[PDB]
Design a protein around this nucleic acid. Sequence first.
RNA 1: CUGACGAGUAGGCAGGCGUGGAGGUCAGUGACGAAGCCUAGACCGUAAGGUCGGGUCGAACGGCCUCUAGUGCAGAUCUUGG
RNA 2: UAUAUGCCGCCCGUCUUGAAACACGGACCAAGGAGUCUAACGUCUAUGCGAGUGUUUGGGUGUAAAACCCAUACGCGUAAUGAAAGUGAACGUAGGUUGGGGCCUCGCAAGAGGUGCACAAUCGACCGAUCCUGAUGUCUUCGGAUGGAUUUGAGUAAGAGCA
RNA 3: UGGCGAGAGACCGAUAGCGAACAAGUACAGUGAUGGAAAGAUGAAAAGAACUUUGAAAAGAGAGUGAAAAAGUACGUGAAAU
Lengths: 103, 58, 148, 185, 52, 51
Amino acid sequence: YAEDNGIVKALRNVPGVETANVASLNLLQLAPGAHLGRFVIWTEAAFTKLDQVWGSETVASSKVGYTLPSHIISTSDVTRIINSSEIQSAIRPAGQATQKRTH
Amino acid sequence: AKSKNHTAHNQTRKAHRNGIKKPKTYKYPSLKGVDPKFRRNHKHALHGTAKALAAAKK
Amino acid sequence: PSRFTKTRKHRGHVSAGKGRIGKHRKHPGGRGMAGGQHHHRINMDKYHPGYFGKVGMRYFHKQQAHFWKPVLNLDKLWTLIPEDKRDQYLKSASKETAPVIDTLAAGYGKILGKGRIPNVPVIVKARFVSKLAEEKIRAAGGVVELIA
Amino acid sequence: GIDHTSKQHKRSGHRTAPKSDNVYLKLLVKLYTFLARRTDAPFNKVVLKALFLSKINRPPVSVSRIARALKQEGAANKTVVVVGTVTDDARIFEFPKTTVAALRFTAGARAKIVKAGGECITLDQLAVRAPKGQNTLILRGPRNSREAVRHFGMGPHKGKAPRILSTGRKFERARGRRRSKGFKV
Amino acid sequence: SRPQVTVHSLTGEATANALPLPAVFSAPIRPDIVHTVFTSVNKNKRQAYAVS
Amino acid sequence: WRKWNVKVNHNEKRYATASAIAATAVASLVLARGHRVEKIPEIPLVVSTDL
RNA sequence: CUGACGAGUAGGCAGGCGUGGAGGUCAGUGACGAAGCCUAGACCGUAAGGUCGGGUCGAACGGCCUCUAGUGCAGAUCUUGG
RNA sequence: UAUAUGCCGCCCGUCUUGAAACACGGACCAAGGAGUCUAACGUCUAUGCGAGUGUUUGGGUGUAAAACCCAUACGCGUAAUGAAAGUGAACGUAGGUUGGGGCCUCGCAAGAGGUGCACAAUCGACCGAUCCUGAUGUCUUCGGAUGGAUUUGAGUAAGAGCA
RNA sequence: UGGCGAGAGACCGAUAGCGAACAAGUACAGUGAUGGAAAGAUGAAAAGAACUUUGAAAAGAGAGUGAAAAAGUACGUGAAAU
């Protein structure tokens, strides 16, 4: 949520469901056991305030000194980069995947 | 309570574990120890020929 | 890290990596820096030469606040100007609008020369300067103002 | 029983894969093993054996070293490659135009390169642009500039900086450093 | 061109409203930094234990 | 006086929380941790402000 | 796919087996009987060890991904008990 | 798996040049049992930022010993060198030569030419000290310009550090 | 790190944790100053065994209570030495 109006007290009883403000966003809740990906149910105010909290190219930061990090690759798929057009015209042709056993 | 005073057994065998090192001569060895009069002259001779091959070549 | 240390890999080997002949014992060389002019002289000569004796004068009740004099090379001297005004100041490379730089405001006690400020005049305000720095500032056009 | 001359089963002492666990760097290594195996151009084998280098063996290249590399004769249009990072330098004022391609980029470095009109390129976009490594330059930052290599090989008469915590007077300047106190070094 | 996440109502019924992604969802998904930082942060609510 | 609490850099802490928030998107990493999202509408799941 | 090679004490490094506890997961197993114990019964792994069947028993305990340590025994004229 | 048979096989641990030893510990079994934690560091890795870095002494918040956000300094780093007063880094695309991965041009190729980052050797330039040279002026004996030298530093030479 | 009243744990789990989970600064030793133990867990509930027989009695054998006395107050599972 982004603005509390009795939501933490509402869902603090039901087992499993934890609530978290946008400006908190605990790491000990988002990735439990150092495993990525928690099924997070956003609210709309939380989604827009998330844009305000972490920043983008348009809005600046709202965290003093902070910029969202830079990648070191443009696309996580590599086979897309290996295929597309420009590499395969510079590639020597392929041998057989498992070789013939001569002698 | 005497013991072994000296040996050289297993001293020419430890050295040849790592293969007696050739001293790595270089092009332009160091002028440390060369006579200082010639050294001052050759300093200014290199100083002159750098001027001759920097200013005249344009 | 307790499961990653090698004394957990030594469970099963009699001496735990310290040797059977030369048994691991209490303090065989001495406690601390013992024997500096003695059985460890070959370790006080090389890797620590000069550890024994006096060199200088005694300065009773030394205050380091007297010796606060950080230096600023002419290489930076434009990071004191913020980055927004910096491009407006490199352009119009002229007098009557020279950027006033209070070098003491970032805590710099001396302005040293290290090479080639651009040709924009600059009013460096400083406590101390060096001779080859003020010549470069003056050759750029601006002047040095001594403050306190 | 073979009489052996050198070490049996000698591990070569080089790296074959990066020790880091960065997923995207393992993807770049995945891509350049392909390019270094199937393009048979030497540039792909210098990028691959520089991704394997550590942080100390990938020192950062200042953007002023990129300015020196673009003041180099006949190289004003080459797309410079820096395997490693690229840090900003506030000491240069005129910075040239052309392309810089690196793994990482500090914020001042992107600000300066994009401000001068250039384009900061991650290495996969360079592999799209230059598969065989057409028209490039590989720079390296200085390795023997470290605080730790300042102390290596400490011994007498070698002039290599004793490892010391607190300097000034009174701390390793006595007997063994001057003539009047015993010997000098 | 952010992929325009739609907003659901309380009774299901996916509303015609749409919202762009806040550009946090294009951050580098790093399992290793999350792992090491999670270990170092998870050690921070421990109490002291000791023998007498 | 064992070292009980561990310093982390602040920016690396924010890096890890940013990577976690980025991982709460498209649900290979969410279906990996259990999390029965096999029958849902599109992810990230946003519910109206009335909640 | 091809080729070479394989003694090793002190010692160094790597890949791993096991234990007490912690975060996660298998919506794991279980009083139609968990853990434990016995078992010239069986299977797997070079080995650390893992697994199953039978008996005994009486309520809790495991696989995996990581974390942490008061973590592994034939010997110390070792300690306590028998 | 037990036994029979053929051949082989001396009790382990420990010091030790060497022990099955007429060397020492060990009657047996169960349980307990021995390189741990901290302060400051070195080298090597991994991560974040990178001319900077370090949220956590403290403050605001809080689903409250967790998480979250933050000012000002401060620590190390960005400058050395001298006992000290003190001074404090571009003659020159911040150099010259040699060797250099890679890149560019020509060539089918072999190679040739140009460019040569890192690094290795070496000659220079500059900064501090030491020893000399010491001019114009001169609170008329203060002041240092210029030029140096087989001297010297843990220096610079478009920054690599911090956690 | 004392007293009282509180909340907690990536701690120990009865040879561990305080010397002390029990009538623990107790039994006991020493003239004294002082030293100082060991020892928890039947079952849900005593329903902790009426009655017959052998024996002088302890006990046994039947019988019986109990899910089960391969739980009988020398009591949970109950290993190895022997």
